[PDB]
């Protein structure tokens, strides 16, 4: 009987530790995903900037070809 309670508390503390580890890994993965979204946002911004760059470059190439 006492052996059974000892084993119970062993599996019990192990379960507590594994739950903590899952929570920590979840937090880390979530932070990484959100910073990736920020990265993608900055990249779309610079994509629009690239549109403006292409406008000016094409206008200059055309004024020089003429």
């Amino acid at each position: 009987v006492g052996n059974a309670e000892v084993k119970l508390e062993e599996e019990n503390r192990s379960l507590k530790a594994d739950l903590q580890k899952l929570k920590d890994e979840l937090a880390s993965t979530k932070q990484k995903l959100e910073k990736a979204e920020n990265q993608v946002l900055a990249m779309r911004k610079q994509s629009e900037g690239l549109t403006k760059e292409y406008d000016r470059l094409l206008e200059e190439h055309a004024k020089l070809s003429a």
Binding site: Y54, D55, L58, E59, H61, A62, K63, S65, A66
Partner: protein
């Protein structure tokens, strides 16, 4: 008759330049207004006008749709033919004729360019 032609050419250039500047001052210029303006510039008798029109057409090329880019290339060929820039005229008209092999108008345009090049 010819007087009417000249008067509408002058009205077109003046008022389309006015609308071009009206839309240029306040934000983006519409593609239809810029195309109208270049359409008129390439028909002017001043070579500087045809040069400016070619510039606007090249600016409009990336913004156009499947059929709009074909029209832009057609008018680029027209404008370069009129400036005796036969190389660029031939290049644009042959580019266009590759996607429409029997557009008879661009065939007659290429033939004008070729007859002027051989002469």
């Amino acid at each position: 008759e010819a007087v009417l032609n000249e008067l509408v050419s002058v009205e077109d250039l003046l008022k389309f330049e006015k609308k071009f500047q009206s839309e240029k001052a306040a934000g983006s210029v519409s593609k239809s207004t810029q195309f109208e303006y270049a359409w008129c510039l390439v028909r002017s008798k001043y070579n500087d006008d045809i040069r400016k029109g070619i510039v606007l057409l090249e600016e409009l090329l990336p913004k156009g749709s499947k059929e709009e880019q074909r029209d832009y290339v057609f008018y680029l060929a027209v404008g370069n033919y009129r400036l005796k820039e036969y190389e660029k005229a031939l290049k644009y008209v042959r580019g266009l004729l590759q996607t429409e092999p029997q557009n008879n108008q661009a065939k007659e345009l290429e033939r004008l360019i070729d007859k002027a090049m051989k002469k």
